UniProtKB/Swiss-Prot annotation, chain B:
Remarks, miscellaneous: The postsynaptic actions of Glu are mediated by a variety of receptors that are named according to their selective agonists. This receptor binds domoate > kainate > quisqualate > glutamate. It does not bind AMPA without coexpression with GRIK5.
Places the protein is found: Cell membrane; Postsynaptic cell membrane
Family: Belongs to the glutamate-gated ion channel (TC 1.A.10.1) family. GRIK2 subfamily.
Role of this protein: Ionotropic glutamate receptor that functions as a cation-permeable ligand-gated ion channel, gated by L-glutamate and the glutamatergic agonist kainic acid. L-glutamate acts as an excitatory neurotransmitter at many synapses in the central nervous system. Binding of the excitatory neurotransmitter L-glutamate induces a conformation change, leading to the opening of the cation channel, and thereby converts the chemical signal to an electrical impulse. The receptor then desensitizes rapidly and enters a transient inactive state, characterized by the presence of bound agonist. Independent of its ionotropic glutamate receptor activity, acts as a thermoreceptor conferring sensitivity to cold temperatures. Functions in dorsal root ganglion neurons.
UniProt name for this protein: Glutamate receptor ionotropic, kainate 2
Positions spanned in the full protein: 203 to 253 of 908
Tissue expression notes: Highest expression is found in the olfactory lobe, piriform cortex, dentate gyrus, hippocampus, granular cell layer of the cerebellum, and in caudate-putamen.
Subunit text: Homotetramer and heterotetramer with GRIK5. Tetramers may be formed by the dimerization of dimers. Assembles into a kainate-gated homomeric channel that does not bind AMPA. Can form functional heteromeric receptors with GRIK4 and GRIK5. Can form functional heteromeric receptors with GRIK3. Interacts with DLG4. Interacts with NETO2. Interacts (via C-terminus) with KLHL17 (via kelch repeats); the interaction targets GRIK2 for degradation via ubiquitin-proteasome pathway.
Length: 101, 51
């Protein structure tokens, strides 16, 4: 279990790494995925060895960049149908009004 | 040989990782050391393996 605070992530990952858990499933609002991935990097773990999965349905909205050359696999799940033209159009339109926040 | 700019580092480190070169000496004014190490990190090239 992830402890209460996000930045307490350290021991848990540390135990996982010591125990040599070479697969992981997550389940949490991607907002938690950000914290857990930053830890998973700074703890020197992003390597082809580990191979995460996410059930949070927003894997597409993270910032995948600083991890992407490392070589880990983050199979995820997305439903918002980016494939269709009109869907993407409406995404963009809503985006042009989304950024007022 | 490191190329002209530092962020150009990526191909070289790619070769080091591919051939599995598990040790290194560097040489640079540390200002280069910083960028080369950042690349070393995001490349999945910074673990308890290498030294
Ligand atoms: C694209 C990528 O990150 N590759 C990784 C690598 O460890 C390997 O190719 C395989 C292991 O199952 O899949 C994953």
């Amino acid at each position: 279990q992830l402890p209460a605070d996000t930045k307490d992530a350290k021991p848990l990952l540390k135990e996982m790494k010591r125990g040599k858990e070479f697969h992981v499933i997550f389940d949490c609002s991607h907002e938690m995925a950000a914290g857990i991935l930053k830890q998973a990097l700074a703890m020197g773990m992003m390597t082809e060895y580990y191979h995460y999965i996410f059930t949070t349905l927003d894997l597409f909205a993270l910032d995948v960049e600083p991890y992407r050359y490392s070589g880990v696999n983050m199979t995820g799940f997305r439903i918002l149908n980016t494939e269709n033209t009109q869907v993407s159009s409406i995404i963009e339109k809503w985006s042009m009004e989304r950024l007022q926040a």
